[PDB]
Design an enzyme around this catalytic site. Structure first.
Site, short mmCIF file in Angstrom:
data_model
loop_
_atom_site.label_atom_id
_atom_site.label_comp_id
_atom_site.label_asym_id
_atom_site.label_seq_id
_atom_site.Cartn_x
_atom_site.Cartn_y
_atom_site.Cartn_z
N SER A 25 70.12 25.11 79.79
CA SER A 25 68.96 24.27 79.56
C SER A 25 67.86 24.34 80.59
CB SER A 25 69.38 22.83 79.36
OG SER A 25 70.12 22.76 78.17
N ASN B 13 68.65 19.58 71.96
CA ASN B 13 68.21 20.95 71.69
C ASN B 13 67.46 21.03 70.37
OD1 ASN B 13 69.66 21.86 73.89
ND2 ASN B 13 71.48 22.27 72.66
N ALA C 236 73.36 24.19 81.55
CA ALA C 236 74.72 24.67 81.36
C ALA C 236 74.88 25.49 80.11
CB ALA C 236 75.69 23.49 81.33
#
Ligand SMILES: *[B]([O])([O])[C][N]S(=O)(=O)C1=[C][C]=C(C2=NN=N[N]2)C(Cl)=[C]1
Length: 358
Positions: free
Chosen positions: A61, A149, A315
């Site tokens: 991210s 997301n 991550a």
């Protein structure tokens, strides 16, 4: 390599690596504008390949900061406005819950409860349209933040439509190339595979899996050198020759919403400096799997504040990344590891290093 920097970095990171069992790590400190690099351990355990300044890591991210800046650049170009309705760029999005949901909301996770992940079942473009048409907001737009997301990923995809460029081509030509990030990739080319670290999850070597809106939400891979250059660019956007990119960087660090002590930018998140370290350290913990928070609109957004701790965690299954910087001090850090270790450990280490140097 001033001894003070050497000592604070090694005294902080060596124990972190031991405690977290991190296989390989690269760190850059930006001090008075210049980068200093440190590496440890293995990019590939089985093949005994060390981490070097050329090793590629999955940013996860932290990619959202590139998406945010690319979107900022599109705004600066006059291609899009954050006040535009999502449907301006995706006319097929006709369902009524989309009335009132703007690109701002997508970019900043405030559309009303778009989920963290696009469902794995979404495989085709038609599946993606169905997903957004059928999604039911829990909340009115602009009232709650839910990190997602599916939110910023859709913003990135829509932000590049007026250019007619693919997301990857837009990112390459408008961000990576002008900033000389020549070892930063959405898709790792064969020529660079020898440098692509493995991630490690439960002791197994892994790379990120394909998914809908992956490029836009978590798909960039980069080296510690390019990431230091990314930090330098975000510390000093006025040195950037390309005017719309300079402006895009400033737009991505503007403060659009507040929740607690944190301010939401485009990709970047910010707190006032000096920060309470427990505030950023504890605040970085994922707690949590889903953390819905009411937000206060900053009306109008505050332009990038130099006295800020600006940061982003990232991550993937096998990697853990962190970037933080303080513009007023010309100070920053990048930490890239090939294990997804807990966020609070990242922020604690970063704070210990930057606080000692400021
Ligand atoms: B960002 O905060 O790093 C996004 N985090 S996430 O939980 O949504 C996530 C996204 C992708 C992946 C992944 N895909 N293939 N390997 N890893 C994970 Cl594990 C988590």
């Amino acid at each position: 390599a001033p001894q003070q920097i050497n000592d604070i970095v090694h005294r902080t990171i060596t124990p972190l690596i031991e405690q977290q069992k991190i296989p390989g790590m690269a760190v850059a400190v930006i001090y008075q504008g210049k980068p200093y690099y440190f590496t440890w351990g293995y990019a590939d355990i089985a093949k005994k390949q060390p981490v070097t300044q050329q090793t590629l890591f999955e940013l996860g991210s932290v990619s959202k900061t590139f998406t945010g800046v690319l979107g900022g650049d599109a705004i600066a170009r006059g291609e899009i406005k954050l006040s535009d309705p999502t449907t301006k760029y995706w006319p097929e999005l006709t369902a009524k819950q989309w009335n009132g949901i703007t690109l701002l909301h997508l970019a900043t996770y405030t559309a009303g409860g778009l989920p963290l992940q696009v469902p794995d079942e979404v495989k085709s473009s038609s599946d993606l349209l169905r997903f957004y048409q059928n999604w039911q907001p829990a909340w009115a737009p602009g009232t709650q933040r839910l990190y997602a997301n599916s939110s910023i990923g859709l913003f990135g995809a829509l932000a590049v439509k007026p250019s007619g460029l693919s997301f990857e081509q837009a990112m390459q030509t408008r961000v990576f190339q002008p900033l000389k990030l020549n070892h930063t990739w959405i898709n790792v080319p064969p020529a660079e595979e020898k440098n692509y670290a493995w991630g490690y999850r439960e002791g197994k070597a892994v790379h990120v899996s394909p998914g809908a809106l992956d490029a836009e939400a978590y798909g960039v891979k980069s080296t510690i050198e390019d990431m230091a250059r990314w930090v330098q660019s975000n510390l000093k956007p006025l040195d950037i020759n390309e005017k719309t990119l300079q402006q895009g960087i400033q737009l991505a660090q503007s403060r659009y919403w507040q929740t607690g002590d944190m301010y939401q930018g485009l990709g970047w998140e910010m707190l006032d400096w000096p920060v309470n370290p427990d505030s950023i350290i504890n605040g970085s913990d994922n707690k949590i799997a889903l953390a819905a928070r009411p937000v206060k609109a900053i009306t109008p957004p505050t332009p990038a504040v130099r006295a800020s701790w600006v940061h982003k965690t990232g991550a993937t299954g096998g990697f853990g990344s962190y970037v933080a910087f303080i513009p007023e001090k010309e100070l920053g850090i990048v930490m890239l590891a090939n294990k997804n270790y807990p966020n609070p450990a990242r922020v604690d280490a970063a704070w210990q290093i930057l606080n000692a140097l400021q």
